[PDB]
Structures are given as structure tokens and as C-alpha cells.
Design a protein around this ligand. Structure first.
Ligand SMILES: O=c1ccn([C@@H]2O[C@H](COP(=O)(O)OP(=O)(O)O)[C@@H](O)[C@H]2O)c(=O)[nH]1
Ligand SMILES: O=c1ccn([C@@H]2O[C@H](COP(=O)(O)OP(=O)(O)O)[C@@H](O)[C@H]2O)c(=O)[nH]1
Ligand SMILES: O=c1ccn([C@@H]2O[C@H](COP(=O)(O)OP(=O)(O)O)[C@@H](O)[C@H]2O)c(=O)[nH]1
Lengths: 450, 450, 450
């Protein structure tokens, strides 16, 4: 049958000591709640009801494009109250899964098992075994079913030794949820309406609740502060690196690797220590990435080596190119096949054609550079002091001597040669040689201050 | 009552294989013994008696400014002999705490508990529970008190199973110390005067010794070699990162973060992987620090982003500034609000005014730069071949074209404009435009070597 | 007696998802099989028989210089079949040790113990204790000897609780190997000839097999995929760092240190976090290496500091030199004593004499620079657009002003002085001063676009 999710995300997250609400803090570059939304979506959820409250405006700006129903909870009166806000929208004969915006590691696989174990008119409850279950509600199994969740303070001596514990995530049909939610009270020490009580209420109705154990404890772990969040971060990154290693990516140290988005890869890819991969990154076969590199939203072709401490963003690099070390590719950098970019070089919004080299101490911006060019050390494309930023066009087989200033807008045609120390403001024609006539003063017998 | 400390710090530290004495090796940028001195001071110690010996001159030069009594021990005849060197200076009615210069992680909190548990005319002894207590003296409790410390070789079968062990740190009043120290002998396999024997001597006098367990084993851990020291280092750094995360600093990976000094922070600060913080550093609200950055003795204002692989020392950065990546701020760099410093830029002992930008391949040194200036790529402030290093003064709203050499001493007044490839040796007046007249030779039909 | 080894290295390594065969994947920069070959050699092996098959051509190109007998196995019919390929070459009265090319961490020390425990006409079998020995063959000891290796599916209830397990590495004399190998069959579920069966066959012959336990479990660990290989990598690096720390090298974080070759060191060497050491590296006394540095095939003299994010390859640095941060030394960089190389500087195949400084934004290539020179910011050695790359020679006590282009081939004699913004194409004589005569246009009353 159909499925919809409810995600609880209204918390202030006081112990984060932040102006952001609790669930907006990121894991692997994405808000915690966004992980849960994505998981709900790939689970097959028709509707996703987002219970929000604190930091309302920030939730809306940061998650403006998410396909969710925005259910604003004016008061935090408990998890049952929270879910009941969305209940008017539950279809009677759809399954409903309840998830927490601050527990982002929960997997689609675990949740499929939960949904599959839900008996008709009943509940599937996700549990977890802890080594020290102190403070948490114990699962009481009478036969194969859950008959009670006994809280720490109520449990007897032998019930305290039970390791199986309630996570609060559960699945039931929409009609059941509407019926049971209306029956939960707040007669307890905290004065709150607990979703937990649905288990007692189901048992009162002679309905079954089946437990499904989570495989990984970390899956159901929430974050109430930044220390806990950093532990979730490390577990997530290590799991991402492990999956890539098992797919054939050589990661020299998985504890020193960060993926903050998606990585598509060929075979025999090598990624050295302390690399960060952000946004959508695609690497072809036998790409090698040296230590300290940062790649954000790039496509890298087969057989390219990126040497240490290169930073690349929104760029494309063709096959057999060599980049780094200490290279910077800014947005719109498009490097063709067999190009060379070297140390202390910055390339911004420019195309560089096949075989061309830019190997030292150079800024190229808003330029088209053709094939088999040689851009010398210390070359700079610049503009006049004016308004907008104009383009430099360099054809094929051009030599640009070191320390040349190319003053946009300007064109240098095929086969041109420019001498070192030149200032180019006028168009250079095909096979034109431009050299600077320097005037120098030579003084003989000049003794330096020892 | 009053308190003074004794710190044992005379050891050669042979297994460090160093020209330094044992306690001078650093943890988090500070000598091990300096940690212990600081802890003693914040505990409220009136006097700190530093027992030193090996590497005497180095101890004095490296710790010249420490408020301690320098007690030179000519021979290392045991811990009791060491403490007795300082005993002539103990006030009869002050408490005395004994600490070890090579066990730097001991906390003020643990030591306050120790002092508080000391019975009158007695001793409080700090103990620790080990899982494998082999080699260490076992604590024998008769009722609530310690009646013996039984060494490995003397213990019977059941005493070997005792996990509680002697750390050697203790507190007693000064008169007791003077009396008992004079009674310790050296009749043992090692021929040494052990401070350990004070426990037996106290029990002989019908005086109480109360045990206080250390909460963390690592607290009382010493370092006899650099492997052990590296473990202390990692435990200290992880504990520092944990405290910051709990205060609301987002540290992406606490295992890849190093603090070597003090950090003051606002809210919503983000610190990426592999950052090093040294000396005294202050970060305002929502400062973001990219991967690989090194910050030593800097003040960073609200809302600044420091992009990857930036190194900053002895510098100030105003609010909403953007630094990096690959930027270098050397001592005396003062950047106003809303400034921009970019890749492969070095700024040394210079002020840069509000809104000004220095975005590529530039050295600025000994300069004052005003507000809303545009310093082009490849700009260099330099000096004549002479003696001292003179100043470059640039006013407000100045444009300095790329690859311009500013030759100090020189002034460029408000609103001036300098063209690319210029050499500035003479003062530039207000609203003055300076452009270089290049002479170029153009040769048509120059065929390049294919 | 004499010894020879057999190394099994024919596997395809399917779960690596690589075009390389299994044993060519690297640990610490060296193929797994190369580790095992080296260990065999230092064990004293006269012959090393390398059983190879898959990726045959790649094995030959990558290991062309290894002193091994190349034994090509056309079909993988089991470990006994593999070893029997080399058996015609076993000397009757030499010991033979069998090792696996995909288990590279096995030590010479463990293997010496194995060889020493081998009884005459018998076998020494290397075993290991696992906490979960499921799937592995259990060692059955009758008295002091091994009488059977019982596989998972054959073991009874109490045999399943045995933790001691078969590793497959063993030692026997050559005649025994020839005799027993010819008797192993393939009547089992997998239809393979197992080397394991030698233990049964020895017991049939009334020959002794003695077990030798491995001290470290990781020693005998193989890698079937890149996740397992990364774990071997981390264990190896941590063990290398631990050995160096125990020798007196201060490594701030051994979990953030990589050695990929050999390191020779003096005393009081300090290596900060995230350093990579490759090839053969030699560091003198009190060398300090800042964070992020990469050193490949370099010799560093006493008392040099290398500041953060410096990359050095195939270079020599004399004593008291200061390098970095952000410095690049390319192959053939030879820096004398007391030199200074600064940020965003690249030095390639050049000698730089004592006291000379190159501190910013500079490329020096194919040059000889004398002693006490001052190479200014923005200096570049370049060539004409021609064929090969010519040399720049700079004598002693030369001042080269900032942004000077040195156009090879060219010589600058002792004591010369070159002004900023100069283009040098002609030889400069001793004590010659060369300054550029600029022509500038000054326009007063030029108002900038606000
Ligand atoms: O009325 C509520 C109660 C809770 N929550 C959120 O649901 C999650 C778990 O609720 P619980 O009371 O079981 O744990 P706590 O919030 O006390 O840590 C937290 O992120 C809460 O902020 C909510 O959105 N509305
Ligand atoms: O006469 C002494 C004996 C010891 N110590 C120092 O006190 C610490 C602990 O002394 P112990 O004999 O219990 O351990 P060991 O020095 O044998 O490791 C070490 O740093 C010693 O160098 C000292 O300064 N003077
Ligand atoms: O006929 C063979 C059988 C195995 N091996 C290699 O020897 C090692 C261990 O052999 P085993 O069958 O015990 O483990 P598996 O290869 O099944 O992981 C592996 O690297 C194999 O590729 C080999 O070279 N020839």
C-alpha cells in the first residue's frame, strides 16, 4: 500500500548554542533534516509532513525547494502532539512512518524492513540494543510481540537488564494513527503527550505491535549538541569511504577523507590523504588526486593527475591533463585534454585548449585560450579601471612570454609570439611577433653596500 | 588553609633521545612542566618549588619568567630526597601538594578533591584504577583508610587482583612532610629514598591516609618517551576539541584539530578539518575557517570567511572580510572590515582599509593602504638596494594596475590611478593618472618553430 | 642450513575492481608483493620463487628488477599446485618458506622463529589466535604437536571454541615438499589442491609438525579488497611512526603521518601533522617540518626549518636554511647553508649559494645563484621561444630587483645590481648597475568612476 512520512523538526536545539534551529545543522554538507527528507523520498513516500516551529523563517529559506507539507507547530507539547498536527492529512489506508529530523543516519533499508513487518491494524516499532540501556524505555516481549515499553524509573530488577530499547520511530496505518493519537494523555512527570503511549493504546485495542531491531546503533542516534553531531559526521564519512573502497576507489586513509555530496568514479582512482569532495563530482578512470586537494562540482576526465594542494570549483578537466600542485580553478574553468596547469596559477571563467600549458605564477580570467599555447610565468589578464570585465581571446599555437600583461578586451591570433615583459593592449595578428624595446641605463663601477 | 606545591622536574629523560631535559618537551605547544606549574597556580598555590637538575641551563632559559622557587637537586637519590630539597621552605601549617613535571594532564578539579579529602595531620593520596595493574603498588584499604602500598613483588595472590594503584601524588601539611621525610630510608633493591614510604610512616604515627580516586586514568599518566607523549597530546587535543564543541563551536572532525594556546569564540563558528590554532586567538560570531588553515596570535572579527590553506600570524581582520585561499598574513597585517585578500598574496606589516581588495599574486609590505582601493594582480612593494626598509603610503579610492612595482618610500594620494606594468618611484598626486609609455617592435610574418 | 622462499602471487584480485593483478596494489608506496620479497631477502633467502599468473605483463614491468625466479602458473588449481610449480627447483636439503603476496605485513622476526622451530624432516606451521575463528581451520594439538587442521564444517562443538587457526604459511625442507606435494589430491568441495593437506600427509609419514603462534594478528592478514588494504596501510603507518617516536623523532600525531620509503634522522627532529615522506629522505639534527609538507627524495641538513605547505622533491638543503611556507623545490634544487626560500616560490634544477634569499613570488630554473644574493619578489628566469632550455648564471653578492626577467642564456657577474622591472638579455659585468628607463604619462585631474 501507499506510504507517507512525518518528520519532527520543531526543536530549538539549545545545547548547540546557535542562531539556527536544531535540525538545520549540517552532516556531510547537508542539513540533518534534509538527509531524513531524502531517505523518506527514496523509501517511496507520497507525502512528507514536516513538523517545524523554532527558527521557522530559517527552515523556510534553507529548505525552500523541498517537496514537503509545512506543518507549523506553535507549541511543543510532546511527540504525540507533534504528529497529531499532521494527522488530518493522513489517508486512512496509507502507512505512516514517523522520523526525527535530528536523527539523520536512519537508512532506507532498515525502514523497509520496519514497514514490511507491520501487521494489519498494528504497529511496527523500531528498537535498538544498547550495552548500557540506562534512562531508556525497555522493550517487553510477550511471545513475538511488544506488550509494554517500561521506562527506567518503573522497571524492576530483571527488566533493568533488558538491553532492547525504544527508538521512537514507528509505522502504522493512517486511521490507526488518527484514532490512537486522540487518546494519548499527558498525565506524567513531564506533562507531555508522548508518542510512546501508542504502544499501550494498540495493546488495549488488541492490536499487534512487532519489534524490528536496528542493525547499526548509530543509525538511530540523534544529535542534541555539536559533540554528538561530530560523532555522527565521522561515522557517516567512514561509511561513505568504506563503500567507495569496496567499489574499487583507493582511499589511502578513509579516516582522512570527506565526501559532501555525490562522487561518480571509474576504475583505478587513487585519492590521497586529506581530500575533500563537495557537490557533484565525477572522476574518470585512473584519476589520481594528491594530498590536500579540494574538489567542488567538477568533472575530471580519464588519466588526469591532480597534484597536492589544488582547489577546484565548477570546472571541467579533460583527459590526460596535469593540474597542480598549488593550482586554483575557479568557476567556469574548462581545461581541454592534455593541458598543464602548474603552481601558483589561478584560472577563472576561461577555456584552455588541448596541449596548452600555464605552469607558474599566472592569473588567467575571462579568457579563451586555444590549443598548444605556451603561457609564460607571471602572465596576467587584466582590465582597465572602468566598469565590467572584458574578454581576452588567444588563438592556437601562441607563445606568450613571461610577465606579459594582457589587457582585455584584446585578441591574439594564431601563431603569434609575444616577448617577455610586454604590455598587450592592441590586437595581435596572425604570425605577429611583438617584443618590448627596453631602455636601460648601465653604470659601471657601482659598489654595493658590501 | 594555605597551599604550596612541589614539582619534580630533574629527570634527564634518556628515552626521549634529546638534548632537552625530560619535562621541557611540549604538549599543545607548552612544556609539560609549564602545564603543571599553571595548574598549581590556578589551584591557589602560594609557592611552587621546582625541583630541577639535568638540563639546568635549558630549564632556566625556557622557563625564565615562571613564578617558582628554583631548587637544584645535585643528585637524583629518589622522590623523597627530591621533595626534601624544598622542605626547609614549607610552612608548618600550609598544605603541600606533590606533582610530577612529566605528568602534565593532572587537573585542578581532581587536585581540589584531593586537598579537600586530606584529614588533619594526615595524607590524601591520589590513586587510580588500572585494568592491568602489574608492576604498580596496590592500595590496601582497611575500612576507609590506606594502611599499605604493597609493591608487585611483595603482594600475595588476592592482592595482585586489586586494581587500585598508587600514583605518587599526595597532599599533607608542611610540618608532617618535614617530620616524615627525615625518616625515609633507602633500604630497598634500588637503593633509593621513595616518597611512597610516607604512607607507612604516617600509619606508624597513627595518622590517617585517605585515598581519592582519579576520574580519568590519563590525568595521572606520565611520559617517559615520545610515543607516550604523543598519546598524551592526542588525549589533550581531543578533550580541548570536545569542550569547544560543547560550547557551540562546529569542529568538523575533532581528531583533526589542534589548539596550542587559547581560543576565544563567538557563536556559530565553523572550523573545517586540519586547522591549527596557536597562541592567543579570538574569533567573532559566524567566522568560518576552511581546511588547512594556520592561525597564530590573531583577532578575527564577526562574519569573516578564511578559505583553505591560509596562514595568518600576529594579525587583525575586521568584520565581513574574506581571506584566502592560499593567503599569507605575516606579523603586523591589519585588515579592516569588508576587505578581500586572495590567492598567492602575502601581506606583511601593513594596514589595509575598508573595502580594499588584494586578490592575486601580490606582495604588500610596510604599507598603509586606504579604503576602497583596488590592488591589481602582480603588484609588489619593494625597496632600493640600500639599508632599512621604507614605507609605501596609498590613500583612499586608488587603482593600482596589475604588475605595478611600488618603490618605497613613496606616496600615492586619494583617487589616483596607476596603469598596468608601471614602476612608481615618485609621489603620485590626488586624482593623478600614471600610465607607462611602452615601445614595442612588431614583426609580421614571424613563423614559430611549428 | 640454506633457505629459499616461495611467494604466491598469481591472483586476479577481482574484488579490487582494478586492471592490476591482486599483489601489485601498494602499501606505503610499494607493491604488496615487493614487501614480501624484501622480507624474504633479509631473512637470508637464496632463491625466491615468484608464482605469478594474472596480469603477467604488468607483474613483469612493475617488478622487472626483482631478484626472483619467475614461475608462471597457467591455471589456479590451488595453493599446493602453485607451490609445486616451483618444486623442481627446491634443493633437497634447504629449508623452504611459503608466503603470500597479498599478506605483506609478515615480519622477518616471526619468520625466523618459524624456521627455528622446524623439526628435522618435519614442518613448522604459523598459526594465529582469533577471537572469532569462524570459517578458519582449527589447530588440534596432541601434546606439543599439530595432528590436524579441522575445517569449520567438520569441527565438533568443543573444536569450534578453539581460537588457534591456520595461516597457511609454513616451512619444511625441499625433499619433504617434493614428496608431499605429489601426494595432495583435490577430493573436496572446491575441487582444489590445498597446501593445508601437507599437515595430514606429514602426520601419515610420522613426521612432526610444530606450531608457532604469530604475535600480531595483523602480521598474517591478507587483503582481498581495498577496504582491507586500507586497514593494512593504517596499521603499517602507525607501526612506522611508533618506531620513529621510540627513536626520538617528535611526531605530533602519528595517525597523521605517512612514510613511503625510508627515513634517516638525527636527534630532536620535529614533524608536524599531515606530513608525507616518500622515497629516501635524510633529516639532520633539529630539523623542523611544518604541517602539510611533502618530502620526496631529499637530504635536509641540521637546523633547517621547513614551514607549512612546502613540497620538495629530489633536492638538497644545507644547514640552517629556512624554507616555506608554500615553497616548491623541484628536482635538482640544491640550496646551500643559511639560504632562505619563501612563499609562492618555485626552484627547479638550480643551485643557490650560501646566505642567498628568494622570498616571494618567483620562479628560478636551470640557474646557478652564488652566495649572499638577494633575488627580489616577482623574479622569473625564462627562455626564448626556441628549442632547449638554457642556463642563467648569477655570481656572488648580486641584487636582482623585483619583477626582473632574466632571459637565459645570460650571466650576471659578482656584485652586480639590477633595478626593479628590468628585462635582462645581455651579460651583466662585475659591479655593474642596470636600471630601466621608464617613460610615463602623467594626466592630472583624472576622476575615477567614483
Ligand atoms: O513536541 C515536540 C516534541 C519533540 N520534538 C522534536 O522531536 C525530537 C525528539 O523528541 P524527544 O522529546 O523524544 O527528545 P528531546 O527533544 O527531549 O531530546 C527532537 O528533535 C524534538 O525537538 C518536536 O518537534 N515537537
Ligand atoms: O630523585 C628524583 C627522582 C625522580 N625524579 C623525577 O620524578 C618523576 C618520577 O619519579 P619515579 O622514580 O617514581 O619514575 P621514573 O623516573 O623511574 O620513571 C620523574 O620525572 C623523575 O625524573 C626527580 O626529579 N628526582
Ligand atoms: O592456485 C593458486 C591459489 C591461490 N593463489 C594465491 O594465494 C593466495 C591465497 O590463496 P587461498 O585459496 O588460501 O585464498 P583466496 O585466494 O581464496 O582468497 C591468494 O592471493 C591467491 O590468489 C595462487 O597464486 N595460486
Amino acid at each position: 500500500k501507499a506510504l507517507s512520512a512525518v518528520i519532527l523538526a520543531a526543536g530549538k536545539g539549545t545545547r548547540m548554542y546557535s542562531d539556527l534551529p536544531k535540525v538545520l545543522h549540517t552532516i556531510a554538507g547537508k542539513p540533518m533534516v534534509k538527509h531524513v527528507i531524502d531517505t523518506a523520498h527514496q523509501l517511496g513516500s507520497e507525502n512528507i509532513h514536516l513538523i517545524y516551529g523554532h527558527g521557522g523563517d530559517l527552515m523556510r529559506t534553507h529548505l525552500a525547494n523541498e517537496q514537503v507539507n509545512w506543518v507549523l507547530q506553535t507549541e511543543q507539547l510532546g511527540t504525540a502532539h507533534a504528529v497529531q498536527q499532521a494527522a488530518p492529512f493522513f489517508k486512512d489506508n496509507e502507512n505512516i512512518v514517523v522520523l526525527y529530523g535530528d536523527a539523520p543516519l536512519i537508512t532506507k533499508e532498515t525502514l523497509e524492513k520496519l514497514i514490511e513487518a507491520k501487521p494489519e491494524n498494528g504497529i511496527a516499532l523500531l528498537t535498538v540494543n544498547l550495552d548500557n540501556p540506562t534512562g531508556y524505555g525497555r522493550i517487553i516481549r510477550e511471545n513475538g510481540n511488544v506488550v509494554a515499553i517500561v521506562e527506567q524509573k518503573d522497571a524492576n530488577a530483571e527488566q533493568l537488564n533488558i538491553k532492547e530499547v525504544n527508538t521512537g520511530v514507528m509505522v502504522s496505518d493512517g486511521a490507526s494513527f488518527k484514532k490512537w493519537l486522540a487518546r494519548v494523555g499527558n498525565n506524567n512527570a513531564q506533562g507531555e503527550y508522548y508518542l510512546t503511549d501508542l504502544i499501550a493504546l494498540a495493546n488495549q485495542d488488541n492490536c499487534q505491535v512487532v519489534a524490528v531491531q536496528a542493525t547499526d546503533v548509530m543509525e538511530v542516534e540523534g544529535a542534541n549538541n555539536r559533540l554528538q553531531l561530530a560523532a555522527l559526521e565521522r561515522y557517516f564519512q567512514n561509511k561513505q569511504a568504506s563503500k567507495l573502497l569496496l567499489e574499487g576507489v583507493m582511499i589511502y586513509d578513509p579516516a582522512r577523507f570527506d565526501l559532501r555530496g555525490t562522487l561518480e568514479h571509474g576504475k583505478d582512482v587513487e585519492i590521497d590523504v586529506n581530500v575533500i569532495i563537495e557537490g557533484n563530482v565525477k572522476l574518470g578512470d585512473r584519476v589520481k588526486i594528491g594530498t590536500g586537494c579540494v574538489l567542488k562540482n567538477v568533472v575530471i576526465g580519464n588519466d588526469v593527475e591532480i597534484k597536492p594542494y589544488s582547489v577546484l570549483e565548477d570546472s571541467i578537466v579533460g583527459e590526460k591533463a596535469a593540474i597542480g600542485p598549488f593550482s586554483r580553478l575557479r568557476p567556469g574553468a574548462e581545461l581541454a585534454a592534455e593541458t598543464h596547469v602548474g603552481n601558483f596559477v589561478e584560472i577563472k571563467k576561461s577555456t584552455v585548449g588541448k596541449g596548452s600549458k600555464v605552469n607558474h605564477l599566472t592569473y588567467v580570467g575571462d579568457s579563451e585560450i586555444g590549443s598548444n599555447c605556451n603561457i609564460g610565468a607571471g602572465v596576467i589578464t587584466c582590465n582597465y579601471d572602468g566598469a565590467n570585465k572584458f574578454k581576452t581571446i588567444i588563438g592556437d599555437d601562441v607563445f606568450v612570454g613571461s610577465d606579459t600583461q594582457l589587457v582585455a578586451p584584446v585578441k591574439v591570433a594564431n601563431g603569434a609570439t609575444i616577448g617577455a615583459g610586454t604590455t598587450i593592449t592592441r590586437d595581435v595578428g596572425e604570425n605577429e611577433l611583438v617584443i618590448t624595446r627596453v631602455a636601460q641605463r648601465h653604470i659601471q663601477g657601482w659598489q654595493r653596500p658590501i
